[PDB]
Every structure is written in C-alpha cells, then in structure tokens.
Amino acid sequence: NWTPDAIRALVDQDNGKLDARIYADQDLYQLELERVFGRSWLMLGHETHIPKIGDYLTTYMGEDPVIMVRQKDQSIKVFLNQCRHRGMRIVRSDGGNAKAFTCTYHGWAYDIAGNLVNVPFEKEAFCDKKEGDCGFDKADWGPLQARVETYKGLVFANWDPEAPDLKTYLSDAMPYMDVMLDRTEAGTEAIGGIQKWVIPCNWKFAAEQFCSDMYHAGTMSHLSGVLAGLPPEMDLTQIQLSKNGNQFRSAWGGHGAGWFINDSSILLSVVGPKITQYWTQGPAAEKAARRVPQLPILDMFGQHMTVFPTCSFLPGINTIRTWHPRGPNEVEVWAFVLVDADAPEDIKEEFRLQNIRTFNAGGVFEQDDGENWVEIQRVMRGHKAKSTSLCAKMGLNVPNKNNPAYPGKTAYVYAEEAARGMYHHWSRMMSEPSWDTLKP
Amino acid sequence: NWTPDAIRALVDQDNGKLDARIYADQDLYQLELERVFGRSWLMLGHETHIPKIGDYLTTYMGEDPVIMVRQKDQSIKVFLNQCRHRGMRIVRSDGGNAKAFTCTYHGWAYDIAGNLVNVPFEKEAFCDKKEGDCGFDKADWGPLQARVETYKGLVFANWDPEAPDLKTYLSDAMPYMDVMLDRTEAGTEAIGGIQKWVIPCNWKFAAEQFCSDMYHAGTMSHLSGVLAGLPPEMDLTQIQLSKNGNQFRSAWGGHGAGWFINDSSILLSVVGPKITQYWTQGPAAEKAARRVPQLPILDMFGQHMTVFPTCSFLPGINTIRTWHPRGPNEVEVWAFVLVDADAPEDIKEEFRLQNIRTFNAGGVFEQDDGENWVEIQRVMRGHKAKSTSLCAKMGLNVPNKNNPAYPGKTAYVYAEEAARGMYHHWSRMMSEPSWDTLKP
Amino acid sequence: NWTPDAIRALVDQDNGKLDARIYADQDLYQLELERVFGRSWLMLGHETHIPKIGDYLTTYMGEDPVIMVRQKDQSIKVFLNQCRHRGMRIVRSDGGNAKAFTCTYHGWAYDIAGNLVNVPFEKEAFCDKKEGDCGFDKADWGPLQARVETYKGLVFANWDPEAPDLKTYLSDAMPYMDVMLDRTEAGTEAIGGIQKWVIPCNWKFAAEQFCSDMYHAGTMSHLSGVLAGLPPEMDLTQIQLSKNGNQFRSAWGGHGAGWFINDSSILLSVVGPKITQYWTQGPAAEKAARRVPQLPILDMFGQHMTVFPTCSFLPGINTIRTWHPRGPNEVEVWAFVLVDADAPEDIKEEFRLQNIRTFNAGGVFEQDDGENWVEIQRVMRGHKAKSTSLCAKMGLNVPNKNNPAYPGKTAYVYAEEAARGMYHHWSRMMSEPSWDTLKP
Amino acid sequence: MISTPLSKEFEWPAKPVSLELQHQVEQFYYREAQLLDHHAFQAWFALLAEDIHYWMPIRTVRTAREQGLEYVPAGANAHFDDTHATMYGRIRQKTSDLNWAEDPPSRTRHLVSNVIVREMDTPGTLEVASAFLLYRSRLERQVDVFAGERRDVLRIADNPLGFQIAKRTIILDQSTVLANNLSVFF
Amino acid sequence: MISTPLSKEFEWPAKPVSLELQHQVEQFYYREAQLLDHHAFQAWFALLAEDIHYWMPIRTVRTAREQGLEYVPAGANAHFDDTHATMYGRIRQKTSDLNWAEDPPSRTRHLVSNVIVREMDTPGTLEVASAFLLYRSRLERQVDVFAGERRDVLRIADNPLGFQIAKRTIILDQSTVLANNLSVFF
Amino acid sequence: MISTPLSKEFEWPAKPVSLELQHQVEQFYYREAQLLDHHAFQAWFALLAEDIHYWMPIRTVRTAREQGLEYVPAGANAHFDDTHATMYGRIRQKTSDLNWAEDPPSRTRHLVSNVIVREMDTPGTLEVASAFLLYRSRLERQVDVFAGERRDVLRIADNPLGFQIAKRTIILDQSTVLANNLSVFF
Numbered sequence A, B, C: 001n002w003t004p005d006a007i008r009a010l011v012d013q014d015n016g017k018l019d020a021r022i023y024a025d026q027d028l029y030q031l032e033l034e035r036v037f038g039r040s041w042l043m044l045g046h047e048t049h050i051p052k053i054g055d056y057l058t059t060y061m062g063e064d065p066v067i068m069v070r071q072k073d074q075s076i077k078v079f080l081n082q083c084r085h086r087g088m089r090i091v092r093s094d095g096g097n098a099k100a101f102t103c104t105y106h107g108w109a110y111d112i113a114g115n116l117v118n119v120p121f122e123k124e125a126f127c128d129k130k131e132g133d134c135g136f137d138k139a140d141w142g143p144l145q146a147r148v149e150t151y152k153g154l155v156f157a158n159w160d161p162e163a164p165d166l167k168t169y170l171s172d173a174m175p176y177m178d179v180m181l182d183r184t185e186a187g188t189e190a191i192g193g194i195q196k197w198v199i200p201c202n203w204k205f206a207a208e209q210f211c212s213d214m215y216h217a218g219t220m221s222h223l224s225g226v227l228a229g230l231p232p233e234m235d236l237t238q239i240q241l242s243k244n245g246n247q248f249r250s251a252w253g254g255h256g257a258g259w260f261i262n263d264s265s266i267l268l269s270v271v272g273p274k275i276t277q278y279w280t281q282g283p284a285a286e287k288a289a290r291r292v293p294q295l296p297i298l299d300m301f302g303q304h305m306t307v308f309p310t311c312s313f314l315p316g317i318n319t320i321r322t323w324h325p326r327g328p329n330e331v332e333v334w335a336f337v338l339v340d341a342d343a344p345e346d347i348k349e350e351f352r353l354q355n356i357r358t359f360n361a362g363g364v365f366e367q368d369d370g371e372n373w374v375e376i377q378r379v380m381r382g383h384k385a386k387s388t389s390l391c392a393k394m395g396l397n398v399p400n401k402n403n404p405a406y407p408g409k410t411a412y413v414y415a416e417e418a419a420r421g422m423y424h425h426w427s428r429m430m431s432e433p434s435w436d437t438l439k440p
Numbered sequence D, E, F: 001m002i003s004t005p006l007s008k009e010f011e012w013p014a015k016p017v018s019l020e021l022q023h024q025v026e027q028f029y030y031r032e033a034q035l036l037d038h039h040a041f042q043a044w045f046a047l048l049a050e051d052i053h054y055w056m057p058i059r060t061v062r063t064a065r066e067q068g069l070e071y072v073p074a075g076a077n078a079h080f081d082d083t084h085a086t087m088y089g090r091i092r093q094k095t096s097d098l099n100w101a102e103d104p105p106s107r108t109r110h111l112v113s114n115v116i117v118r119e120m121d122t123p124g125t126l127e128v129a130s131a132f133l134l135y136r137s138r139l140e141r142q143v144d145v146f147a148g149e150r151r152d153v154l155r156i157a158d159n160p161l162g163f164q165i166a167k168r169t170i171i172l173d174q175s176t177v178l179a180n181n182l183s184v185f186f
C-alpha cells in the first residue's frame, strides 16, 4: 500500500508540486478517514443549535454519524449515532429535544449522555438473579464518545484522546477566526436552517479554496456572480480589478486565510452596502476593532478561511460550513449563516437574504465554485490525468510579499502559501503515526 | 488480506461479541462467496415450482444465476445459467416449460439436462471430417452443474462435491423444519408468485433475525404491525406482553429457530383466527402432531427459523424466502407462500391473503423489519462505526433457560444462542479450507 | 496482484480457451489502462472532423479526455484536456473553433498547440522582477501531449514515445482497412454527428465481435434485423444461408477482419440495392479495385474489422466507431459514418439513412448486438460465472480453411482465429513491460 | 372492460367522454394525490368505498412464447390484495407514529396524467385508466421512483370530493421491486 | 411554425385553442401511449401517416459562442430518421419474437403532458408540442428514464382515433445517450 | 389559503373552477415551461410581477413528535428567497455567458401536472397548486431529477400570456439537496 515515504512524496512544498492522486485514490481516502478525520478537530455546529437541555443535532465526523447534545450541566457531548447491540441508528431526526434516545430495533434506550440505561427484558434474558451477574453490564455498551470543545460559539469534536486540545491545534490562527466570531461580547448566533447538498468532488478542493484561493475570485470564476449584483445601468466594464491584499499560513496545522485590503468592493458585491457599512463604520465596527486588536480588521475585506481539515467560512459574508467527505469523489456541504447576536434586526435580515443570494446551493457565487470542482473530479478518472503533477508554485520563493501588520506567516492575496501549508500538513497527518512527533 | 486467525477473531461466542466489519468489508464478502455460498446448501424453490417435465425456474446461488429444471426421469438438475462460448445468459425468462435452452448470441443449444447438443456450423467450422476430430467436443462445454437434493418439498443445491449431503448438513434441525414442511402426507405446495425485492443491507442481518431474533418482535419493531390487525375498538393497551418460549441452536451448521409457548396471540396477530384454529385444533392439527413427534408442536406459536446460510421461514404464517446476497451492502428477498396441499381452500385463501398483508414487500410487518437493516447498513459506512464491537451476549452463561421438551440445544425465546452459533458457524466456514475439519 | 505468468495463463490460443476473469476483474482493468490503452494507437476521429485551423474535437484515450486540434501548419495535435494548475477541464464543448483554450477556474490560457501562454497575475504573484525569475515558467506547465498520426483520413494517437509508429503497428492489416478508406483519390469524409451511447459491457466483447465474429450474424443474433429490411411479401423463409467466406488474423497486433465471398445478400440486407450496386459495379467500384490490388475487393461482402484495441468498422456499410472503456463493466460507443468524398449525393444520402436504420443506438442491427454483451456482463457478477473457462476453439487446428487470394493468415468466415490473435495480443501487451520484446 | 388483461391496452369508449366529466375525474385524482402527498391518511381512506378491492399483481419476465404468464394471476401471491378492512389496518399503522419504515415519513409526489375515462352501464359508475409517476424520497438520500398505470372503478359519491374508489388495480412497471419496500399507497 | 429551431420555444398561437380541440388531442395522445405501453405495435403503426417523417436529432454540448451548433442538423447523422417504409420494418422487427433487445419486452410508461396545440393553415392539420417522460424498465433491474419534447404534425383522420401522425420530431434531453439502446418508440 | 402549512394539503375550493379557467391556467404553465426549457430567460422573467416573492424553504427530517419542525420557517435560511430585484440579477447571470455552472447550459424538462386552481377574493387573482417533475441533464452524463409542488399566486395580466406570477412557493421533495446545485428555476 502506502509507505510514509510514498505518501510524503505526493506533496512537495519546497518545489511547489502536488500529485493528483491525492484527490482520487481510494486507498489514500481510507487512510484519510483513519489518520486525518479520525484524529482532527471537526466542526459540528454552533452552540445556538442546541441552546437548551436535551437539545440535539445529528451531524457527522467524516462518514460517522454523531449526536451533539446539550447536557443537564450545560456541557455538550458528542457520541456515535450507533446502537451497540446490532448497529442501528439511534436517533433518526435532524435535531430536536430529547429526554432519551431509543433504538427502534430492540428498544435499547440511552440517556442524553449516551449511557445505556434501559435494556428490554434484561431481568428475564440477560442475567440470573440480579443485573450484571452473568457478564452483561449496560455500562459496557455505550456508543463511542468524542472529545468536545467549543471556540467562541463553534462546537468542534475529536475522537483521539492523544490529540492536542482545540486551542493548541488552532496554532496562531485564532485572531483570523475572531474577525467573524469575536466582534462582540454578545457572541454570534446561527440563523435557523442548515442547508445541505451533495457535490461530486474531493473535500480537499473545497478545503483548499477557502484556505488559500482568492485567485479564482480575482480572475474568472465569479464574473457572473458579481454581475448579478450590479444595477441595470452597470456592466462588468465598470468594476475595477482587485490586486491589494494578503494571505496567512498557520504556523502549524494547515489553516489558512486571505483577504483584500482597503477595498470594500469585493465585500460590497456579495453583502451589499448595508452590511458593508455595519462591518466598517459605527459602534459595532469600533467595538470589533477593540476586540480583535492583533489584526487591522477594519482594513480587511472579503476574507476567506479554512480551519483544517474541513471548517470553512467567509468573515463578513458570514457563511460557514463543514465539508463532510463521502469517498474520494464526493462531499456534502453543510452550511449555515452566523450573525452577531446583538446586531439590529435589519442587519440580521440583510445577512440572511444576501447569504441565500450568494453562498448557497442556489446562490449566484456558489454554483460556479462547485462546477469547477466537479469537472476536475470527472477528469481525474483518467489514467494519465489521475497521476498529473499539478502546480502549487504560486508565490513560492517570491520575495517581499508578507505584511508585518498581521501575525504569523503571510504572503500575497494571490498566493498558494496557505495552500502549500494545507497539503504539507495533510502529508504529515497521513505519514506520522503518533502525536509524539505530529503535535505542535 | 485475511488470515484464518484474523477471521476467527471477528466473532467471539465465548464472550459474546461481534466485529461490525463482518457486515461491510468487501474482502470478507468475496471470501463469503467462495467459502460460504460456494459450498453451502442453498434453497432455490419448491418442487411444485417445476411440476412437469421440462419445467424450469431461474434463480440464484449467491450471485450466480442458475436454472432449476425438471428432468425426464422426474429428477431435478441445477446448472449455471451461462453459455460456455462467450458467457451469455442461456435462459432469459423467470420460468416456463422447455424442450431445449438456446443461447441467442451464437445459437448454441442445450438440452434440459444442461448438455450442449447443437453447435451451429459445427461441421463446417469446428471439425474436419467428423465431429470432434479437431479437438472440439460438445461434451466438454456444458455449464457447471450443482449437486441437488430436496427436503420435503424444498429444493436445495450445492456446488461443492466434498460438502456433506443435505440431511447431514441439516444436523439436528429437521424436526423444527417439519413443523412447516411435514404436517401432512400430502406435503406442501407453493402459491404461485415469487415476490422479489431489493434491500440495501447485508444478508447476515436478515439470516440472523430469522435464526434467533424474536426479541425485536417482543419489543419495539412490530407494534404498528400488531396494531394494524386490531379491531377499531382495541388499541395497543389491550395486548399482553409475551414472555414465555424457547429457541434452538443446531448442533452443527448455524441453524436456528425460536417460538412462544402456549400463547397463540403472536400467531393470531399475523395469521388471524381461522388459521390459528386450523394450526391448533381438529384433524389437520392432530395429524401434524403425530407426524412431528419430536416436538410439542401444538404448544408452539409464531416460530421463526433459518437454515444457514440464507433459507428462512415462519412456520404457521408460512412465508419462506431466500436472501440472495448482492455485495456486502445489498440483498434480494425472494419469497413465496407454502400451504399444506390438502388444506381446505378457504384455509389456503386465508394463508394467501394474510401473507400479502404481513410478510411481503408491502406488508405491515416486513416493511418495519427492513427499515432496521437498511439504517444499520448506512451507519456502517462510517470509519469508527464499521469497526464497532457489538453485543451478542444476550443469554450468554445465563443458566436454566433450556427446555428438555425439545431436541438439541435450547435457550430462552429472548436469547442470542442461535445467533451466536450462526456467527460461530460462519467463522468456521470462513477460516477452515477443507470439509476434512468442517464436516459434522 | 498479477504476475506476467498469471496474466498469460488467462488466454490459451494453443488450446483455445479464455478465462472469463479478463472481462470483469478490476485489477486487470487498471493494468489495461496502463499496459494497453496507455501505449496503443487509439482512434480519435477523422481529419474532416477538424478541417480548418483552430478546429477541435474533444474525445477520449481510454478514460482520459483529450483535445484533438488542427494546427496553424495543418498538423494535428492531441493533448490531455486537463489544466496543469488544479486539474480543471480546459475545454467544455464537444468541438468548435478556437484561438485559445482557457481554464475557467483561474483563467490559465492555452494556445491551440497546448502551450500555456497566459497566467493571470503572473507579474504580481508568480515572479519578482521578470517572468520565470522565481522558479515559475509557463513552459513547464502544458498538458501531456500524445503522438499523433493519421492513416488515410483516420486520426490515431498514442501516449508512449517507445511504441512503434502507426503503420508498423498496423502490421499486415492495411489493405483490409483500405477496402473502406482508400477506394478513391478523393478520400473519405465523415457525415456530421458522432453518435454516443453507453453500454454496460466490457470493451473486449465489442472489439472481439468486430475483429472475428461473423458467426453471430450467420446464426441467431440478427434474424429480426434482416427481417426488418424485407418487403411485406417476404419472410425469413426466403433468405438463404450464408456459408462462404474468410477471415484474417494480423501477423502482429491483434487486428482482425472477416467477410462473405461472392454473395451480396449480407450487404443488401443492411445497405440496400443502391449502395450494393455502387459498391460493386460502375466506375467507382472499378477504381476501388485498382486502388486496393492486394485483395479481391469486388468479391467481398459485409466485412467487419477491428484495429486493436478499440477501432472497429464495417466496410461497405461504413459505420466506424471507437469503444471507449469505462471500467471493466461499461463502454461508450462513439460512432460516425464515412462516405467517399466524391460519391454522388444520392449515394451519400443512402449511406446516411441506411446507417441510422441499422448500426446506431436505435438501429435494427445494433440493438440486438448490445443486448448480448450486456447480458453476458450481468452474469459474470457471479462467483463461479466470473472464473469460467470459455471456448475459443472454433477453427483451431481445423485444416484447409485459409484462402491464398488474401494476404496474411486467413481462416473460415466462421472462425475464432482472429479472435484468438486478439486475446493473444492482449496477453502480450498485458505481460511484457517493454517494446524491446513487444514490437513486431 | 373490467377484466381486460393487464397486458392489453385499456378499452376506451368509441369517443371520449365530455369535457365536464374529464375535468371532474382529473380534479378528483389531483385532490387524492394532495391527500397522499401531505400524509392526510384518514382523509384519503375516506375515499375508499366499503366494497373496495385494491390490488397490485406481481409482474414476471417472460420470453415470447410464455408472455401470457407475465402477470401473476388473481388468487395467487401479489404485492397488494386488500379490502376495506385490511386497508383500514394499514391506515392505523400509518397514523400510529410507530411505523418505523415511515418514521420519519417519506416525501412523495404522485403525478397523475394520461387520464382516460369510460362510463359504465350503472349510472354514476366509471372505469378510469391513468398513468402515474410516484416519486418517493426519505431520510438523507434515499430515492425511489415508481411508474405505472392505475385502472379504477369510481362511483359518484356524496362526499366533498364527489367520488369514492370502488376498485383499484395497479400496474407497476417493474418485475423485481427495486425499492426496499412498498410503504406508500398508489 | 414547423421549422422553428429545436433550441427555441414552440410558437404557440396568440390565444389557446378551444377546450374541445385540446381534449381531442390529449385523448389521442393518451390512447397512443396505451398502445405503446401495452406493446400494441401494429395498432400503433396504423397511426403513422403514409408520408410520416419521424426524426430524433443528436444533441451536442457547446459553450456559449457555439450554441447554434447544439443540434446536429437535418441531413446529417441522427438517432432516428424514418419513413413509413423504415418504420414498418422496425415494427416487423418488434413483432417478430426474434428482437433480442426486446425479448423479453421492456416495460414502458409514456407520460404525456404540457400539450400545446396550434391550428395550421390547412383544415384538419395541427402542430402540437408536448413534454414526455418515458420510463423503461426491463429484465431484473434495468431502468432507463428519458425526458424531452415532441413536436408533431397531426392530421384529422377517419380511423377510430380520429388522427394520424404526419410528422414527429423528438427532442431528447440528453447529449450522450445514457441507455444501452433506443429500442422503444417515442 | 396563502398561509396553509406546506406540510398540509392545498385548500381547494368546494367545487372545481370552470373548464375555461383551468385551460387558461394550464396553458399558461405549459408556455412558462417552454420558456424555461428553451432558455428564454428574459421572456420568462417578464412573467414575474414586480412584487414577486419566490421562495423555496429547506425541508428537514423529523420523527413523529417533532414533525411540525419539518419546514425551516419563513424568515430563516432557505434555498431560494427572492424578490424582483434579486431574480433580475439571477437572470443577468444566466444570460451573461459567464455562468460556468450553466456554460454549457443544462437540458431541462418541466413537466406540469395536477393543476388545482382557486379563485381569490380579488378579481383577477388566483392561488394555484401544481405538481412538477423537473428533469435536468448536462454535459456528458449528469442527471438530476427534482420533484415537488408549486403553490402560486397568479394575477391576470395584459401581457401575451395573460398572467404574471405574483408569488411562488416551491415544495421540493428532498431534505438534503441531491444535485450539486440549484442552477435551474422552478
């Protein structure tokens, strides 16, 4: 199969080259389920998805279905959505409120903590004189639990007891996240309705685009999307090129962000003038700048980001989504919209409507993004095409593109530095068996 | 791949644990096609499906299409439904009467015995002066034949010349089968119409349920099915719990049955009062009890059974079916209804109508059964979920649950003893290359 | 996996036997993509598909999408339809005229030669002071090119620099091709409209049928097709058997052809009396016979042929097609119709209409051909069925069936000599790593 | 003709029925489908006459000379073969909240077209053939498509829909059932 | 308009035709589909006029500036391009019991909707557009779905259906044919 | 009733509307589908009233006791939630030749059936429910099938089609969107 050496060779960040096999190979995909999704922090939803005791959300870690559920002590637990008797899905709804989770096959019932608490016929069929006296103990048969940590509203989970805690894993990337998540003491909240759709491409195309690829938006991909936002009197001949900005590569972990500087037009085309004003001027913007002092946030526009492997979002448009993998050739997008909890309701309503318009299965920006990933994937079915050496050189050894205004490693807004770190980090996770070496 | 040791570890009947990989792993599935379906006795249909000379039925052994056909001497033969020239399906219908089976590609024709008897252009193209004088002999190119044996009406087949005969393979299970198959000197007959449908689950979920799982019917799975049978004036609050019965584990081979004792309500809900009376009282029931003296058959209600690997039925409801495997993640159910050939026609008509109502693709019991298997299968796509250790402990080392009224090994009606023997037998077949050790 | 010895054993041309695994095994299929499609000459289309500078056709080599495009110097180039940045399909249309091929993801633009000529933001993002001074050179990132050669109108391509040239590879088969391709100094032309459809069978069934299998048409497969062409007053009782003809096995490479001699009825049923007269009598036929002097072309009727691996056609009906493989269990047919460029237009119109009638997705001959391949494929899902030893003995060691009127090795029209050489050649390609031994 | 073979085309009347009758029958069918597609099972069941016979025979695959064996006959095994009493039980199951194959419920669409009406010899009674496309999707990704023909006997009725279904025979254009169940009504 | 591009919408008349005519045309189409879906091939063929032209062009994939190349034109290769004589031969093949692609026969459903009628300048002649969904299933598990548009010229006729088909052009909403054949009529 | 829950059946009028009105509404819908299926996007957009609200809510999977949570409500996330201005922008994108998800363009068929009409309390205004099957295929092999229900408010209008769409709500019979986008109009 694949030696660590064989896997590391698929990615060359020094020479800027990627082996196309990373996006199609089935054997590599199964190793990703073990070595990447099995021990990464994965985004499941937002605390506001499960405000009250017994509230739950069913979602995924990789291809494993899990239940995320608010506990009596206000903690959140996450466990596999699988009965330990014969494997039935315990919870069949997308979310709701429970006092108990019951398996409909043989009626095994679980409390909201995931403990097994009721086995029909235990007394008659599973023991002799008292519970547990013939080797059957309900304590033994609870579904696998994940580690759970939140970061300013976002709920992340990780199966691996040996992995670093959440903040450690986030490396030097937290201020970039804060641009969206920490603008106000009030925190954020999720607009109801997670939109879910299926794209026949590899997760890494989508993870990489939000990590490192403003290039596609500053060139061809979103011309018609921008056009959709213009008044009848204007055409694409009256839209100026965007050339000034930077991108960030996290010190550890494969995270990435990019943005334009001191040009609000990228943002204006997607979110409109009302949100642009809110984002930049007045008391809410002032408070944000005090709350995220590590960054010149009022000069940053149209930011993209990925928290590796699959949590991606666009601060200021405020779409956020997880890419659930479905083999090497398919992904599900699970997206929702975040708003500052104390924003005026006209602002919340504009975030809601502009999001549906743009970054949505039906949206005028997203539809063109996915069409690209799907066509790439189709071509990689070819035998020559699947082994192509792809160019990740953009920005490589190109000097004087960093920006000392920003923490950590930076490069030009049109660059693949973030992308190179993403694939470099993937190759580490894929080739190093233990956190002994992998941890920051 | 998989060592015998690696395979035996997937099943622990001493500690009562199953590795979930048995239901999803593709490599294990291909070994099942070789080591289980390739040398097990598989149920193909009933003698009454092919009453007359030249009558045939096309069906399956695993994923191999076969022809079962009545011979001139009243014997039955079974051979692969595949032309030996280039592989075309020889017979394209579900069944009928033939004098010959002709391949439509190049017109090679086969007698009802499966011998090749007519090769178009043999004289001009395949030999010089007389047939066979250049190395082509029709005798050499007949499709593979299976061993064929019937057991009281049921036709079983086996490819493996080294396997035990049918009755030997049936171990100590025949009386349990006789409860359905040997109630009368007249034998049984199949109502016309084999119903066929596709369920996206592993065959073993269905084989196990009919082997060993009354638990699901005494708990949650069939509440609505029972409710469907109640008069408007009754609800589920007027249905008593069922707690008394036993199950049987065959001495060899993975076979299993279970039933309730001296409580006809399980049966009544499915088959109605007319069949319940016929099954228990009057001349037909009396004669059955004389014909199956090894069992207290008039005290047994709602019996389930599997003859390993994939022949399952419900004596007294009289549904019978084979689970044809279609990879690890899919099965076809091929089911039909058996009735005593000498039953009054009102009884035959009630069996027919109650069967469609209950254990049928549209039936009020079956639809809920399959929904369970399908959801399990979906969850096992997960990486953690596919390697779960599942509980097969029920009844394990729980004393004093046997019943000396019944032959062989018995346990409580709510138990997994039969199920444990099923998986133990699967693991033997999967890990022992020769009948030298595998035979009883 | 598969040793050369293991692969050679799948085909026995001395004893006339084929292992059925060749048509279903996935591992063998991937080796076919490397060892057969990766280094064979594959038919892409006709020069008349791309008459003018900048005209292009998108099609396939195996499962790799390629662009075939007319160059400024009237040469033709073929290169992979895949952007070297992240893999997007460069060209999204079936064909047209271009001055440039632009990737819609990041706007990388390619000239019609396949060179990368425009990288958006190269100056700002990819270099320091001048193009190429930081390691990024557009010359490095063009899509893979194929070798390209034409043979009398047909465009073939090959990835492998070490393979023999086209004519060398065609061995002693060119006169047989010329029967269709070289009847006139005017050459042939393609009627517009490539018909494309998907058949769930292995490519080798279709490649073999056109290589070597007149048998299926002289027996059962096309009775109804012939019947469709008869006047109301006639039935199949008035159609004489066809028994006289020959077939050809190329000296090297797996090519094959067959035909009837001095009996135009096979041709008449498919192409009609007007084409039959044109093919046999008058100035056009006379000139053809002068142009193909190596063969008695006016005595040849209903010829079939395959140029290995996947270029097949029927001289005189003039259907031509490539079988694009889509895994072991599927193929796409890409077919078109060729006519002599100087034929009278009534003749061209009859070729057009008779072709749609007969050898077309809707055609009365083709529909029955495919039904055979599809049913074979379905049966090979079986475990016993997939390992069957199939009979390729027809004609083997049957003496005095050659015809000295024809060049190279010949045998009876009903024979599998051509077919045996096809599979023998497949087994060589599959087991011999280097042209050092494989070349003629 | 009520006993025309299901393999044979519908025996439509020499000339089509009036526009008014065509409209009433179509409108009835569209309301029936609304009830099903919105899981109004009690309201739907009210449309079944007390003497309803609801049947869906099994279809088999046969070569030319045994084509009259295509349909498994009346009086043998079948996919549905129901009375007002058994259909009532099915409806109890469907409205119980314990029908696990329908909990959560399927999303269905019954498209109704090709409606051909025949007036029978009893006033107020019609024989109607129609084509259907039944789209069913459930849970995350499951989709089943069923297509076929319905042949009904309708009776004019004093209910707010103006008809009851006295007989329903469903031709399904499948042999092997490709869905994992038939947990929806046709 | 008979030579409107297939890429262009149907040129419906300023106001819709009468209810009576709409009903007659729809009812004709539903009877035609019954004949096909019950394999009444001789009876169906009787509906084709002696001057029938039955055509289904090939559809190709094109980017914006070469969109007028979508349809392979008349006079070039095509999926069907038939006369009364060639259609007769197809019907002989279909009723022979030797058509292996149809032996055993496919199970089809032709759903007919979106019927738009235009009266032409000759009395008794109509141009009609409609949408179709053709469901085909065969053998154990094979299913093919075809969708598209038909544009016909119908002529009033003294037969028991009251029309014959004088022209049929079929738009299929596929480029690559996704089925293994086109062994059914549209 | 305009605010009937989407989980509930359509509130049809006690008796069906006139034949003439049914025909006008159906004929309108068939012309609308022609425009869409032939990519006449400007002409289609002309059918949207200036006060149009075009919405397609998200559908979720729920067990029995949380079934009233099926539909994500108005005022929350959705698949479409559009005005005349945003729909205009979508149309600019669709006619630009730069919409890569539609370049090359999809092949669609909108089959329209089960049309139920209700006259509202303002003359000239109708509430209409219908069923749809939207077939979409593109590039070589991609096929997406969408089925569902549309509930419209139509207004009589002086345009050559005689109506404008004042409101459109689309029920899609999916929870997870199974297509890679919703790049077509319903």
Ligand code: FES
Binding pocket: A083, A084, A085, A086, A087, A088, A103, A104, A105, A106, A107, A108
């Ligand atoms: S599978 Fe959950 S209780 Fe049995």
Ligand code: FES
Binding pocket: B083, B084, B085, B086, B087, B088, B103, B104, B105, B106, B107, B108
């Ligand atoms: S494949 Fe059966 S005779 Fe050739």
Ligand code: FES
Binding pocket: C083, C084, C085, C086, C087, C088, C103, C104, C105, C106, C107, C108
């Ligand atoms: S993938 Fe082609 S320019 Fe980026």
Ligand SMILES: [Fe+2]
Binding pocket: A216, A217, A221, A222, A365, A369
């Ligand atoms: Fe984008």
Ligand SMILES: [Fe+2]
Binding pocket: B216, B217, B221, B222, B365, B369
């Ligand atoms: Fe059950």
Ligand SMILES: [Fe+2]
Binding pocket: C216, C217, C221, C222, C365, C369
């Ligand atoms: Fe042929």
